[PDB]
Amino acid sequence: LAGLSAALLRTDSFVGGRWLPAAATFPVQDPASGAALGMVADCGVREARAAVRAAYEAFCRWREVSAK
Amino acid sequence: LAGLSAALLRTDSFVGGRWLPAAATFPVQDPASGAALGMVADCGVREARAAVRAAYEAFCRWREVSAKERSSLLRKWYNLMIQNKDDLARIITAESGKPLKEAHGEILYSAFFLEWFSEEARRVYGDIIHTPAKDRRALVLKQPIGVAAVITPWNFPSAMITRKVGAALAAGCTVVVKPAEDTPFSALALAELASQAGIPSGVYNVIPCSRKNAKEVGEAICTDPLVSKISFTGSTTTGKILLHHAANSVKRVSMELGGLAPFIVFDSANVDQAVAGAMASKFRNTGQTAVCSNQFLVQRGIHDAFVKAFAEAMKKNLRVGNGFEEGTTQGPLINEKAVEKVEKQVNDAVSKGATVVTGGKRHQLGKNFFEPTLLCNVTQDMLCTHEETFGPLAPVIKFDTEEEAIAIANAADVGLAGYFYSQDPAQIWRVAEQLEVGMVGVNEGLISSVECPFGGVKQSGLGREGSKYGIDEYLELKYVCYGGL
Amino acid sequence: LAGLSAALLRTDSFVGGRWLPAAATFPVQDPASGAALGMVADCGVREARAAVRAAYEAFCRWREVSAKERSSLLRKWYNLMIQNKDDLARIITAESGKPLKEAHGEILYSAFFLEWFSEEARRVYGDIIHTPAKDRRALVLKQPIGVAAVITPWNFPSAMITRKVGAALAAGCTVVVKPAEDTPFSALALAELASQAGIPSGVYNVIPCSRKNAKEVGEAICTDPLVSKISFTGSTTTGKILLHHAANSVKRVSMELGGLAPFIVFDSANVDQAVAGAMASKFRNTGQTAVCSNQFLVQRGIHDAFVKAFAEAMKKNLRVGNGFEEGTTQGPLINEKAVEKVEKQVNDAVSKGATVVTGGKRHQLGKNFFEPTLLCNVTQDMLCTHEETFGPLAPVIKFDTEEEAIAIANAADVGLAGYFYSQDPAQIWRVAEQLEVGMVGVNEGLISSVECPFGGVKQSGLGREGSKYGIDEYLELKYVCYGGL
Amino acid sequence: NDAVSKGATVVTGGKRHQLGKNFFEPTLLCNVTQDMLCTHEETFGPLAPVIKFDTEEEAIAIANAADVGL
């Protein structure tokens, strides 16, 4: 169940290199035991448009990075 | 980022002297780095009606407290602000994005309003009037209105609250503050300090809420029959909606609405001074303020010399970047919608005649940063629908005569702040008096002051804040005809 | 009836210095005898927009006239009113129906407002404020708002106009008056005198109109972008409609809305004096005024002695009849709808517990006359929907304690005038300060005075008229930061 | 209020309590009448309306009034 590297188990969205929580959250449960696994950010259109802009700006620089 | 007195950074609403969380919350992020700052309570109509009742009950007791006592508490609150100025400033930079130095400037200004009204509390004077009749004496008392709904913008997350609440409490009223969702923290930091100062429970209430609940809560507190006064600073569109809400119960209202501020430079002006003045009046808070000179009317003679010296000052002093980092002079724009409006204005102007003199695209840091822009050859007709578009943008419109400049400046049915530079004694009076604006700066680009009356004329607002007139917005006159003599 | 200076009795609207008839007209009749008084112009939206433009253009010149000059004209106008007081009084009695003696009292009061503001014109002072910065000086100027839409009721067809227009002109503003359709004449008589005085064309405009056009014209002038201020006195229902019209363009507003006035008689009161005070405060203008004490809260101890002495005073001094005839003390009710509301109130109260002490039916002269009524054993709940029912009716509600009387009086979310009689020095202050009203009479039933501030709190109004605060409703503050020093 | 303004006589505490918030003063009104309980069949609070009666048959008739019975 636990014992995991706390950094691997995450509940916030990951946008622009940062962990951003959302106004809402949704529960996640172990489909076998029904146990609560955690409260994950429930992104909305706003968080999505912002994640897109973040990706678009990263693209203009990432496309320039050498393939190697 | 952190290191703050945990008590200053708050996430719950502050009602009835207690920190109450809400059923929902909304995220707050650093406009520069995009970092998560915290999850703030998202109050709804229920929490608002409850905050109002809390304020109304506190009012029936607070109105009874001696003015010397209310004055004392207003001062302790001021001292607490000064004691925590560094942390209070960091919170402003964190949520508004403005550079630390500017945030420190706001925290002082904000603290000065509490100090100032503290002094006004003991000076509410009634009058004794003489009337013909010998069988009576006329007395005029001044009493507090009651509960006031205070709605503030994000530009000055602290000073905008403090200048209204200071007056309200000094007058003997209580308040329910609904802070901007982009910057709720500064409003709650104040709340913490208000409980440390000993402000009685229910006298100062804060109900943060996001866009969703903004509509509902706004109408809830501007409609509630226990609320007798409304103080709002923001857009004209919201202002008119609140004015309708108020209309239904004849509530006293005072508000400041975002307008266009003309900055006229006449031939007889000291160039460097005009430029220095233009620099401060346009880039303070990255051009994001209602009193930020949007259009520059410059006279033919001195035009060129000015436009050149202005641009040279922009390159030399404006350093775009993160507000917490040393040397930053321009912070980010509050959000994406904002950047889009600046772009809109710049393009609309260039494609219509304007000539970009320096930086007219997004800044190379991306996100919400925009390059300080200066376009010349701009024309009047290029400002339509951008009367509420704030950003580090400076359109220069050339003019020939004074009559022309005044005519152009008084154009809009707007009228908040206005600036002009000149060395002609006579001209200074003519313009200062003819400029249909609420505030006029003469050979100065920064006119802030807690002892002077801030506000606007025509559609820019109602009433005034600060100065010796500020407390008036919260009092009611009672004529007492003492007869039977 | 006639014999008046033909120039004083007018039927056309007065716009731009000229008498202009309208496409339509409406009849005006003597509320007592039903006689035809004249056919008055019925202005429509077109005539109103034109009257506004006329006022706006006059404003751009009038604002420039020296205060000593505007003051002089305001005084000549006053002298003209006094010179014609007898005829001006007859016109009031002719259209309002109030007794001549009362009409003479109004004409003086009305003339006194012009006299008073005449004196205020030269006393609009700006300030010089001290600020930390040594490179600047703070000046605060006061300037007129612009064009003001003035809407008046029929109760005081002259004084209600004069107290608003006096202030407006003294401040340097121009006005467009829309008088009540029941009493338009007094407003035009003033106009004639304003042209005799030499008031510049367009400074004072009158646009009479009937019920039909009332809605349209009302919204036309409270909406017009050339109008910057609205002054209204009347019903709460209309007031809220105008408040919405104003909301759309953020217009400055001041208004007085018909409320219930409590008249508390305490045990320590001088009976005769209380009665004398109750007589004047309830039957002046046959109980048809917003400041007319509707409910009488009388304390157990002195109750009976009071109710009896009151009734005995009503029989001895109230003589119903035609206002022009010697000895008349009670005139007619403005119209049928009015009589029906009084009947409504009387019946609703008797059939619910009340006990009619004297005259509770229509008067034997018929038409719009009603018998002076005095019901005792009345209870709070019997005043619902009659908060705007004016007539020679006096419901007496008994009470035990002071806390009770104050609680009952402050009941409504209303608050215009309030009266009470007592001989206890301490009690006089407690009540006078706790009575949530705009004006309080202490051991006096008549508190009119042009040098004192008239108005109300909560839903009874906004702003004040008369006194040294009256002119403030028409000025705008301008903070001038004189820097570069 | 509905009761006092309709005949009832407040014998003790009939306003909100001086602590404010949700506290109410224990109230006892006498001279109350049957018709003053309409729509308040589900109004709970420290309130006690006293209705006088003459005979037993009367009391039972009044009590069994409502189509209620807990």
Tab-separated table of N, CA and C in Angstrom, chain D residues 34-70:
chain	number	residue	atom	x	y	z
D	34	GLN	N	-55.946	29.458	19.409
D	34	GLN	CA	-55.712	28.385	18.445
D	34	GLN	C	-55.188	28.837	17.078
D	35	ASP	N	-55.934	29.719	16.419
D	35	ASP	CA	-55.582	30.228	15.092
D	35	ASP	C	-54.181	30.841	14.926
D	36	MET	N	-53.459	31.036	16.024
D	36	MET	CA	-52.132	31.642	15.950
D	36	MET	C	-50.995	30.634	15.799
D	37	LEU	N	-51.322	29.385	15.487
D	37	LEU	CA	-50.289	28.363	15.354
D	37	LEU	C	-50.066	27.902	13.912
D	38	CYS	N	-50.820	28.484	12.984
D	38	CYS	CA	-50.739	28.123	11.568
D	38	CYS	C	-49.371	28.346	10.918
D	39	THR	N	-48.879	27.309	10.237
D	39	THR	CA	-47.582	27.316	9.543
D	39	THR	C	-46.392	27.244	10.505
D	40	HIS	N	-46.686	27.206	11.801
D	40	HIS	CA	-45.638	27.126	12.807
D	40	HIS	C	-45.614	25.743	13.460
D	41	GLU	N	-46.345	24.798	12.866
D	41	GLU	CA	-46.422	23.430	13.380
D	41	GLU	C	-45.047	22.774	13.367
D	42	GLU	N	-44.116	23.397	12.647
D	42	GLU	CA	-42.755	22.887	12.550
D	42	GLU	C	-41.733	23.960	12.945
D	43	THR	N	-42.187	24.910	13.763
D	43	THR	CA	-41.348	25.996	14.272
D	43	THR	C	-40.960	25.650	15.711
D	44	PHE	N	-39.718	25.207	15.895
D	44	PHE	CA	-39.234	24.823	17.211
D	44	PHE	C	-38.325	25.879	17.823
D	45	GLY	N	-38.546	26.162	19.099
D	45	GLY	CA	-37.754	27.156	19.800
D	45	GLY	C	-38.230	27.260	21.238
D	46	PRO	N	-37.496	27.964	22.112
D	46	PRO	CA	-37.888	28.109	23.519
D	46	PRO	C	-39.091	29.030	23.675
D	47	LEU	N	-40.195	28.668	23.031
D	47	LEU	CA	-41.409	29.467	23.052
D	47	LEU	C	-42.619	28.707	23.613
D	48	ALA	N	-43.345	29.328	24.542
D	48	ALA	CA	-44.499	28.676	25.155
D	48	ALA	C	-45.819	29.459	25.148
D	49	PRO	N	-46.688	29.224	24.143
D	49	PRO	CA	-47.988	29.910	24.052
D	49	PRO	C	-49.047	29.220	24.923
D	50	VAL	N	-49.640	29.958	25.863
D	50	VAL	CA	-50.671	29.423	26.759
D	50	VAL	C	-52.091	29.770	26.301
D	51	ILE	N	-52.888	28.745	26.015
D	51	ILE	CA	-54.270	28.922	25.575
D	51	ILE	C	-55.218	28.457	26.680
D	52	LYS	N	-56.044	29.372	27.176
D	52	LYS	CA	-56.998	29.051	28.230
D	52	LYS	C	-58.201	28.284	27.666
D	53	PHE	N	-58.783	27.400	28.476
D	53	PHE	CA	-59.954	26.631	28.055
D	53	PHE	C	-60.885	26.440	29.251
D	54	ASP	N	-62.154	26.151	28.972
D	54	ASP	CA	-63.150	25.983	30.028
D	54	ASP	C	-63.411	24.534	30.422
D	55	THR	N	-63.798	23.726	29.445
D	55	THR	CA	-64.126	22.338	29.709
D	55	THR	C	-63.180	21.318	29.095
D	56	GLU	N	-63.242	20.099	29.625
D	56	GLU	CA	-62.413	18.991	29.167
D	56	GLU	C	-62.697	18.683	27.705
D	57	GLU	N	-63.978	18.574	27.365
D	57	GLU	CA	-64.385	18.287	25.995
D	57	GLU	C	-63.715	19.278	25.042
D	58	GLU	N	-63.613	20.520	25.503
D	58	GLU	CA	-63.010	21.611	24.747
D	58	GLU	C	-61.511	21.402	24.528
D	59	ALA	N	-60.808	21.060	25.607
D	59	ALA	CA	-59.366	20.826	25.569
D	59	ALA	C	-59.017	19.678	24.627
D	60	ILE	N	-59.763	18.587	24.736
D	60	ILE	CA	-59.551	17.420	23.892
D	60	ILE	C	-59.817	17.793	22.431
D	61	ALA	N	-60.903	18.527	22.203
D	61	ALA	CA	-61.274	18.952	20.857
D	61	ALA	C	-60.180	19.808	20.239
D	62	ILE	N	-59.627	20.723	21.032
D	62	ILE	CA	-58.560	21.603	20.556
D	62	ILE	C	-57.289	20.812	20.283
D	63	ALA	N	-56.924	19.944	21.223
D	63	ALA	CA	-55.715	19.131	21.112
D	63	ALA	C	-55.738	18.220	19.904
D	64	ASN	N	-56.874	17.581	19.663
D	64	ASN	CA	-56.986	16.682	18.528
D	64	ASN	C	-57.182	17.447	17.229
D	65	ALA	N	-57.199	18.772	17.325
D	65	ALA	CA	-57.395	19.623	16.157
D	65	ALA	C	-56.619	19.117	14.950
D	66	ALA	N	-55.333	19.448	14.894
D	66	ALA	CA	-54.483	19.048	13.774
D	66	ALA	C	-54.641	17.585	13.351
D	67	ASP	N	-54.250	17.295	12.110
D	67	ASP	CA	-54.300	15.935	11.582
D	67	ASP	C	-52.935	15.346	11.940
D	68	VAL	N	-52.378	15.887	13.020
D	68	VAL	CA	-51.086	15.484	13.548
D	68	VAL	C	-51.316	14.602	14.788
D	69	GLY	N	-50.257	13.981	15.296
D	69	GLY	CA	-50.412	13.143	16.469
D	69	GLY	C	-49.181	12.353	16.856
D	70	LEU	N	-48.228	13.016	17.500
D	70	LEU	CA	-47.004	12.361	17.937
D	70	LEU	C	-47.030	12.206	19.456
